[PDB]
């Protein structure tokens, strides 16, 4: 696979050129006729999808093509800039895959430590996603069994997430977002138990330091636990 990355770099540079052109739409737009406004946005869409396809690499695309790109320094940063341009559906897919292959991506991020850059774009995307997507993302992130049978023990996938800066951060905002849909009018009752329990297990030192901390966490946790376990979640998470 020494040639596998040589192909990846080519894709990155090919996509980076598209990016700078897409980021230039704002300018080439202010000096164009009225007739061009609809047509120029259409051309912008096609390029955004061109970048999107360069990620998934599209029968249905190998889930590995996008993973390898998420192993290169300049590759992970490029994705962070492509996310804001992608549509809700496209971005929801990129996020899903990231969580599905997170432990590996984290292992490869150990040296560089540049994953945190993806936290900002993803946090904004969640508010376009309904309750279904939120819970669905939580199941994959924590890697719950397909059989939906509540595990009594921990798993390598979920654990690697809590001991990570980005991983733990992404988990909190997903719950935080899940808190929004909840109060405004349950599938969370089965996903929350797993989140709270695992957080109420992994030792203080093992758990990593979140980049940020959602304010509405104390309220969300108090919905599923008692005052004694709640005070523990507040201690470890620095709530």
Curated annotation (Swiss-Prot):
Changing residue 6 to A: In mut1; Abolishes RNA-binding, localization to P-body and interaction with the decapping machinery. Changing residue 5 to A: In mut1; Abolishes RNA-binding, localization to P-body and interaction with the decapping machinery. Coiled coil: none annotated. Residues 3-239 are annotated as: Region C. Ubiquitous. It is found in: Cytoplasm, P-body; Nucleus; Nucleus, PML body; Nucleus speckle. Changing residue 107 to A: In mut1; Abolishes RNA-binding, localization to P-body and interaction with the decapping machinery. Residues 3-239 are annotated as: Involved in nuclear speckle localization. Changing residue 77 to A: In mut1; Abolishes RNA-binding, localization to P-body and interaction with the decapping machinery. Changing residue 13 to A: In mut2; Abolishes interaction with the decapping machinery and localization to P-body. It comes from the Eukaryota. RNA-binding protein involved in deadenylation-dependent decapping of mRNAs, leading to the degradation of mRNAs. Acts as a scaffold protein that connects deadenylation and decapping machinery. Required for cytoplasmic mRNA processing body (P-body) assembly. Interacts (via region A) with DDX6/RCK. Interacts (via region H and region C) with LSM1 and LSM4. Interacts (via region N) with DCP1A, DCP2, EDC3, EDC4 and XRN1. Interacts with the CCR4-NOT complex. Interacts with the Lsm-containing SMN-Sm protein complex. Interacts with EIF4ENIF1/4E-T. The region A, also named N-term, mediates the interaction with DDX6/RCK and is required for cytoplasmic mRNA processing body assembly. The region C, also named Pat-C, is required for RNA-binding and mediates the binding with the Lsm-containing SMN-Sm protein complex and the decapping machinery. It folds into an alpha-alpha superhelix, exposing conserved and basic residues on one side of the domain. Belongs to the PAT1 family. This is Protein PAT1 homolog 1. It comes from Homo sapiens (Human).
């Amino acid at each position: 696979d020494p040639d596998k990355r040589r192909k990846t770099l080519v894709i990155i540079e090919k996509t980076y050129s598209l990016l700078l052109d897409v980021e230039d739409y704002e300018r080439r737009y202010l000096l164009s006729l009225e007739e061009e406004r609809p047509a120029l946005m259409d051309d912008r869409k096609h390029k955004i999808c061109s970048m999107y396809d360069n990620l998934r690499g599209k029968e249905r695309p190998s889930d590995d093509h996008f993973v390898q790109i998420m192993c290169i320094r300049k590759g992970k940063r490029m994705v962070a800039r492509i996310l804001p341009f992608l549509s809700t559906e496209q971005a929801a897919d990129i996020l899903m895959t990231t969580a599905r292959n997170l432990p590996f991506l984290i292992k490869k991020d150990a040296q560089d430590e540049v994953l945190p850059c993806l936290l900002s774009p993803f946090s904004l995307l969640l508010y376009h996603l309904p309750s279904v997507s939120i819970t669905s993302l939580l199941r994959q992130l924590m890697n719950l069994p397909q059989s939906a049978a509540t595990p009594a023990l921990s798993n390598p996938h979920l654990t690697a997430v809590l001991q990570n800066k980005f991983g733990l951060s992404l988990l909190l905002i997903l719950l935080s977002r899940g808190e929004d849909l909840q109060s405004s009018d349950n599938q969370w009752t089965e996903v929350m138990f797993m989140a709270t329990r695992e957080l109420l297990r992994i030792p203080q030192a093992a758990l990593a330091k979140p980049i940020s901390i959602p304010t509405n966490l104390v309220s969300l946790f108090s919905r599923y636990v008692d005052r004694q376990k709640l005070n523990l979640l507040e201690t470890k998470l620095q709530l």
